[PDB]
Amino acid sequence: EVKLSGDARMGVMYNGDDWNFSSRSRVLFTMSGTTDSGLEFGASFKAHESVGAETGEDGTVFLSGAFGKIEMGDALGASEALFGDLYEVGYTDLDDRGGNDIPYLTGDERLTAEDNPVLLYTYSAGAFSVAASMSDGKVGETSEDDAQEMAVAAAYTFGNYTVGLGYEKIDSPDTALMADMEQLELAAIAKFGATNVKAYYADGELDRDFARAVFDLTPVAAAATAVDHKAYGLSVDSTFGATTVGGYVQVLDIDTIDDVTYYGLGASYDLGGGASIVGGIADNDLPNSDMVADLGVKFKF
Amino acid sequence: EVKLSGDARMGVMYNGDDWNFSSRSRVLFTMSGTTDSGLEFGASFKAHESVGAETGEDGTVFLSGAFGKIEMGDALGASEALFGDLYEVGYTDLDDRGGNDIPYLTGDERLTAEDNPVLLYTYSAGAFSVAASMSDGKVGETSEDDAQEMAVAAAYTFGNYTVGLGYEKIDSPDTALMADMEQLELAAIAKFGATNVKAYYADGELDRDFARAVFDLTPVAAAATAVDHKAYGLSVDSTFGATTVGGYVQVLDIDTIDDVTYYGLGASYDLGGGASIVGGIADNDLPNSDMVADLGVKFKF
Amino acid sequence: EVKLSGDARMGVMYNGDDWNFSSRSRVLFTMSGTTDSGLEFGASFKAHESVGAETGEDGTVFLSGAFGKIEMGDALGASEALFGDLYEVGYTDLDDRGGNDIPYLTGDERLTAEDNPVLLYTYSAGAFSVAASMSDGKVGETSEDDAQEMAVAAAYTFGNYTVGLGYEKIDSPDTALMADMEQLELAAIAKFGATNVKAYYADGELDRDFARAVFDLTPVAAAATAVDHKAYGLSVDSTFGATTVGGYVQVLDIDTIDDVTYYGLGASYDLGGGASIVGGIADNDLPNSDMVADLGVKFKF
Ligand SMILES: CCCCCCCCOCCOCCOCCOCCO
Ligand SMILES: CCCCCCCCOCCOCCOCCOCCO
Ligand SMILES: CCCCCCCCOCCOCCOCCOCCO
Ligand SMILES: CCCCCCCCOCCOCCOCCOCCO
Ligand SMILES: CCCCCCCCOCCOCCOCCOCCO
Ligand SMILES: CCCCCCCCOCCOCCOCCOCCO
Ligand SMILES: CCCCCCCCOCCOCCOCCOCCO
Ligand SMILES: CCCCCCCCOCCOCCOCCOCCO
Ligand SMILES: CCCCCCCCOCCOCCOCCOCCO
Ligand SMILES: CCCCCCCCOCCOCCOCCOCCO
Ligand SMILES: CCCCCCCCOCCOCCOCCOCCO
Ligand SMILES: CCCCCCCCOCCOCCOCCOCCO
Ligand SMILES: [Ca+2]
Ligand SMILES: [Ca+2]
Ligand SMILES: [Ca+2]
Ligand SMILES: [Ca+2]
Ligand SMILES: [Ca+2]
Ligand SMILES: [Ca+2]
Ligand SMILES: [Ca+2]
Numbered sequence A, B, C: 001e002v003k004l005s006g007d008a009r010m011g012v013m014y015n016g017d018d019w020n021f022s023s024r025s026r027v028l029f030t031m032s033g034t035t036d037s038g039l040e041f042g043a044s045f046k047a048h049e050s051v052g053a054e055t056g057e058d059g060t061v062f063l064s065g066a067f068g069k070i071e072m073g074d075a076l077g078a079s080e081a082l083f084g085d086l087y088e089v090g091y092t093d094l095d096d097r098g099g100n101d102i103p104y105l106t107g108d109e110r111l112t113a114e115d116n117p118v119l120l121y122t123y124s125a126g127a128f129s130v131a132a133s134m135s136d137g138k139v140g141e142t143s144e145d146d147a148q149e150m151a152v153a154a155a156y157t158f159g160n161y162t163v164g165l166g167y168e169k170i171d172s173p174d175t176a177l178m179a180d181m182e183q184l185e186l187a188a189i190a191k192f193g194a195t196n197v198k199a200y201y202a203d204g205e206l207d208r209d210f211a212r213a214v215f216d217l218t219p220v221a222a223a224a225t226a227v228d229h230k231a232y233g234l235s236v237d238s239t240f241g242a243t244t245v246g247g248y249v250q251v252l253d254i255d256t257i258d259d260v261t262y263y264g265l266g267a268s269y270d271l272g273g274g275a276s277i278v279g280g281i282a283d284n285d286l287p288n289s290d291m292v293a294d295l296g297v298k299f300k301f
């Protein structure tokens, strides 16, 4: 079976200096089936991703049963699969100054590429959830060695609370050229009625020149070394009637390179029927950074 | 909600010297919704446009209410939105020698580009219609200055007749490099039963080197100047049973560069069920020009 | 009318030296209609082919009636349209060492390209079938001369047996640069209940440097000459319950260049509901060649 859904948005976005019109529309194909014994299977991708979905680079394919779910393609890594992101600000998703996304080390297109899908396994039973993910270590479908990513995460929900932890790592094919990386995460999520609170703390080490590129800094001409880092953040959103209001703040601190605090604040108003008016403000504390903002409408179909 | 429709065509096309097979198929995604108070919203794009629809370059998104309709993306400019084009000739739409399209100055991909949608506002009440359109003046979603287009048009229907006028303009970011342009249009449309008649007259001024490029002439190495131009045309089509027969003639006259008269004549025969046999002939009076022609079938799905 | 269907696959594939994850998903658009007198028409293409389907390069458009069926776009040539391919091995279709496809000389993207569809005509009456195909001889929709392909084939079914023959040819635009080519085929297909047997023999001549490129050999710097070739193969597959087992062997023998025997063996297990577990092995006898293999699941939607 093949089902269709879609979304679209239109409005004005401020890039720090000028306003521009910003709009888009997308269609999602959701495909599903069930075998004779009740294993469920499916696949999905968006219309603008159709070339990539044909090589494994975009979209996902899955098989699930009593054993849990196996998904291959452009999949999330294990930690992101269980804890997600902080409150999304602005109708265009204003990630220009850092954004709402939590800084996971693996999955979500870190190594996914043409002819190179990644794997995500999930399982839940009651109150508990576990996820595990990995890439295959070879470029495309070739025999050339690639960096290889892997992660494992577990969560437990008790009442209003889910708490969890994840561990992620990237193994370098050549540690003279790129240091191995790893990150450990603790995440907590709480709903107190109309209010959602999400918080995380992450700690680990990154390749030096990969870390410098986060801050848009040229690499140093030396053999690869690792730098220690930490990241933590929080978001709060609450709904009163048709109005949701929310925001987040995150800081990323990489030893010997730099630190940044980035944040955003936005609101939406539900018009019903799949339409909402959405606007927001986002920034970070780096020297140059002017605040980005937007105001428009989002539609679901 | 997401609906599907499509079209396809196949036949033989003569390019002035040789015949070639010419065929295509397309799918249109039409998405729609209604808010709780009855504002209607939607989006559409074709499958071959899906990459562009995701940045605002192709397809359109709209919101309408009692106030009229706001559309953003790859939109028509205000004059084209109210008066359209002359009778379309040939199953492949034989625009090779000039074509049936009326020469509007703005909208319809004049400035629309990646991350750069344009805006069209329309409103009707009874017998009267107004449209207004503009681009935002900045390249992409950047702060780089772009040419900016704008147009306004109004029409009035009285019986068999709609008459209207439009005014369009493009403001140059640097008039040493490209002159400002403007065009005023008068259009009339009349249906006399099975017969449709459409006529327009346009007058204004164009950038010199933009005008020379219409006639495929190299630019002159001097500071930009403006040239005066006029354009006018007429088409007639009539239906008798399953057969429609029609044609058009247009002339474009640009002062100090050149003039051209271009025309076409074609027919279609409806087979019912969404299929028709369509063929046509088109040419212009320039020196080289051999007549283009085609014959094939068009399908709607 | 527009209908949707799709497919997806995921598993592990061995390239001769290493295992890699390999997955994809696709959506097919099938469009159909009927005229008032009952001529049927349609078009189809897959979502990843939507750009190509808009110029004639990918997908097909057709019209059929009592006269047979005319199809234009990315069509099969006449022989492939009647006799098909040998048993397909592996969930990824392991064609890496030669594959299951029968080596037809024309159609199936030999000359199909942007703005350049090819034509396939088919007709059946009772026990007999005929097909005829051709390209138009001009590059794109231009007047530049291209190689031109053509083929004719006929088949007759009597009981469990279909036997047939086809003749295919490519006319070179310049025989100093590329020799003319031709191939004659005899094919037989037999179903003996759960068992399918397909066999063919082909004989003809190929351009020298086109033949050398099959074996990945550099061209010779001389005026084009033709080399004689023969190809023949067989496949057998049988189904017992949910299990199909099958394989094929083909040899290609080009005089003065080289010969190769390539083969594959695979199985599938139907899980019902549109899902199957599929795996296979394939190889050829050339010097370097290590065996390719895969194991995964295929889904239809
Ligand atoms: C020259 C400025 C052009 C600005 C064009 C904006 C196009 C997008 O429309 C959305 C703007 O956000 C505000 C809210 O619109 C929602 C409808 O009105 C509410 C009725 O209950
Ligand atoms: C553990 C891996 C973390 C990788 C993703 C981190 C994403 C963090 O967002 C950083 C936010 O800052 C934005 C970019 O910095 C460039 C700013 O311009 C420099 C001078 O103002
Ligand atoms: C297991 C979860 C533990 C999570 C603990 C950390 C959550 C709090 O960190 C939030 C960020 O630090 C706040 C201060 O930054 C202030 C300045 O930015 C301007 C905001 O307008
Ligand atoms: C806290 C949530 C709300 C954040 C709202 C941000 C403010 C947005 O409103 C201002 C819109 O006015 C800007 C100008 O429009 C520019 C149009 O571009 C066309 C130029 O000719
Ligand atoms: C070697 C020349 C090949 C030409 C191929 C033409 C393919 C397209 O078919 C359409 C041609 O236009 C003529 C009309 O066809 C309509 C069906 O016949 C009418 C029955 O009432
Ligand atoms: C007001 C803006 C008008 C811009 C669009 C005008 C489109 C007009 O069609 C012109 C028709 O002539 C075709 C092109 O000329 C090249 C012919 O080859 C030269 C020698 O034969
Ligand atoms: C407010 C609407 C006013 C419209 C007036 C103009 C309509 C007529 O112009 C049409 C073109 O001029 C006709 C002469 O060209 C003849 C030669 O071309 C060969 C045709 O086979
Ligand atoms: C006034 C409306 C009618 C316009 C009809 C134009 C004339 C079309 O009919 C002629 C078709 O015959 C041309 C040849 O077919 C070429 C096929 O290409 C394959 C070459 O091997
Ligand atoms: C680290 C190795 C990862 C391998 C991932 C394989 C992902 C694809 O799954 C398909 C493998 O083929 C075997 C059969 O799976 C079918 C389900 O089990 C049968 C229940 O009746
Ligand atoms: C009549 C036209 C035939 C054109 C298609 C033939 C396809 C045949 O498959 C050939 C199989 O061999 C694979 C390619 O050879 C390269 C191997 O590497 C060389 C040294 O091992
Ligand atoms: C009109 C149809 C006539 C078809 C006759 C030919 C069919 C048989 O040819 C098959 C291939 O030759 C078999 C020998 O190759 C053996 C070695 O390869 C290793 C297999 O594991
Ligand atoms: C005759 C039909 C059966 C052909 C089956 C081929 C054999 C397939 O099974 C072996 C799978 O085990 C291989 C290893 O998995 C590799 C995963 O890649 C991740 C590396 O970290
Ligand atoms: Ca985001
Ligand atoms: Ca992410
Ligand atoms: Ca790989
Ligand atoms: Ca046209
Ligand atoms: Ca136009
Ligand atoms: Ca812009
Ligand atoms: Ca194959």
Ligand SMILES: [Ca+2]
Pocket (backbone or CB within 6 Å): C080, C101, C102, C104, C108
């Ligand atoms: Ca083939």
Ligand SMILES: [Ca+2]
Pocket (backbone or CB within 6 Å): B020, B021, C115, C116, C117, C136, C137, C138, C139, C140, C141, C142
């Ligand atoms: Ca051609």
